[PDB]
Amino acid sequence: MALIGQTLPSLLDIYNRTDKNGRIARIVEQLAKTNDILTDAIYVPCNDGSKHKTTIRAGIPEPVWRRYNQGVQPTKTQTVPVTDTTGMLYDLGFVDKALADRSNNAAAFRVSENMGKLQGFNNKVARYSIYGNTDAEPEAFMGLAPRFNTLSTSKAASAENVFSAGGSGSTNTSIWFMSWGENTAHMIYPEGMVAGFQHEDLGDDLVSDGNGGQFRAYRDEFKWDIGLSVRDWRSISRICNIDVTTLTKDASTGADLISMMVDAYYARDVAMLGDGKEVIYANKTIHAWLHKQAMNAKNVNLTIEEYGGKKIVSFLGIPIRRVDAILNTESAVTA
Template sequence: MTSALTSTALTLADWSKRLDPDGKVPKIAELLNQTNEILEDCVHIEGNLPTGHRFTLRTGLPTVYYRTLNQGVPTSKSTTTQVDEACGILEARSHIDVELAKLNGNSAAFRLSEDSGFLEAMNQTWVNGLFYGNPGTDPRQVLGLSTRYSSLSAGNAQNIIDAGGSGSDNTSIWLVGWGEDTVACPFPKGSMAGLMHQDLGEETVYDSNNYGYQALRTLYQWKTGLMVKDWRYAVRIANVDVSDLVGQTGTQASTASTAIIKAMSRAIDRIPFPGRCKLAFYANRTVYSGLKVAALDKSNYALGIQDAITQFGNAYQMTTFLGIPLRKVDQISNAETRVT
């Protein structure tokens, strides 16, 4: 199974190549992609607000009628509402002792290697917010997917599949259809997509004893949000019992109706028009590893491993389910509470 996407729906790699031809930002974008597989699929759009993106959501369709000759029909209209999706600001600062940088010889390369830890931390925080962000408990966060798809009695419950787990070691598998009109990550109007890197130069900084020393300072900033313009294009397979999955017993026995292979097939059927979006599954390391091992079984035709190339031209082995990429996301928890 394949999915199409228009060329106007840009990934982080596309934006970085457009905005910074000297290669500095694309290098950082590539480093992000190496530790964040979601960026292979995620569509970024420039918001129409300084704080995020406002869009019009259709809440009701117009009424249409059959008519006969010489007889008219009533007028009708659709109903809409406006939704604002706010962006969050992730920020980190790095201070490297000037003398330490001199010892390395190539201070620029040394600074990048030192700052890679900050990139990884921002990556993990962004992904965690993408799935679990809740501005109700922390107004600085974006509204994450798990917060949006959190109840089996909500209006979007059609896109929550219950995998049967009832203990305290549950996880979720997500199917997301990325696209400008489905699910995307906006960035504020007038800003740039992805992580911004700013060299602040050499300055005097102070240690814990308030003693000064010279340091090379770097600022990293990432302004991003999550927009679910059409809730039908994200599906949560919730209540996956990790113990059952590892042991292939109970709710995750091969014959169980709640087995994840069957749930993943049902999830695809919940996407109205797969051709409108770029589909990808997301699961944590435990689930991903189990599915990858299952893909090695030649009798399992739904799962596969195929050669692929990242947006930056690097070859890798991609696990797929019915042709849809399966991405490994460590930030998806193995200790989710049961979705009811």
């Protein structure tokens, strides 16, 4: 609790990994008591090893009618690049090479640590897929903040709620509508978790030293690197709300409407004509509450989905997933 933060998996792991009296070390395997969320999405490589430098269109008028033989005057079109870059994160793992051998095996530690530490890594990447701008970098999403236009362009993703309490340490959340096809960019050096790599051999080293030069060990390192993109902007749509108080007021009745969900399926649409996946994002506490207000009376969840397989999502008929976007943010992005 006081001395350091337990630097190195020492003995406790080897007696908890475990064999437990196997058979082979690492009884396949273990489960993770952590929330999970769909990513998913898609990856592309991007020019040129950073950023991506995009396109848009912005203003392309105007054809004229042919009266007589007059076709006078030309016209043309302009454009402007945009996009952002990524941000790197990587961590290393250590054990004692002499103690991977009861019983002798690497697959235990190597594969188990790869899978579990993959779970934790993914937990963090989803942790920051929704936030981050002014910090030690990656990446960006809060850029939907302003509540009115002209300070930016709000509107099309700004359907909003009417209250959003923000007195002290509170709160509110949001729900999301997006599409993908607007990829996540990774530098041309592959996207997977790799690592995957073990520049191991020797060790090197302890806490300097402790006056003692350490000994052989097992090193590995992990490496991950992604970065969202907005190939266009006219696609995503969120709402600030609510929070839990005014939504408790509705068994199914009137205090805060459930109507604006349709706005989310309608403020979108622009091409996209096609296109690919598309999705709807809620967290968890919002999900079951949405059901409580929807299936008790007025509205009608039109269908259910036997999707892909995989399982069930429902409505409409676009799959809805579960996220860890938690239950408390601030106001700001209200509208």
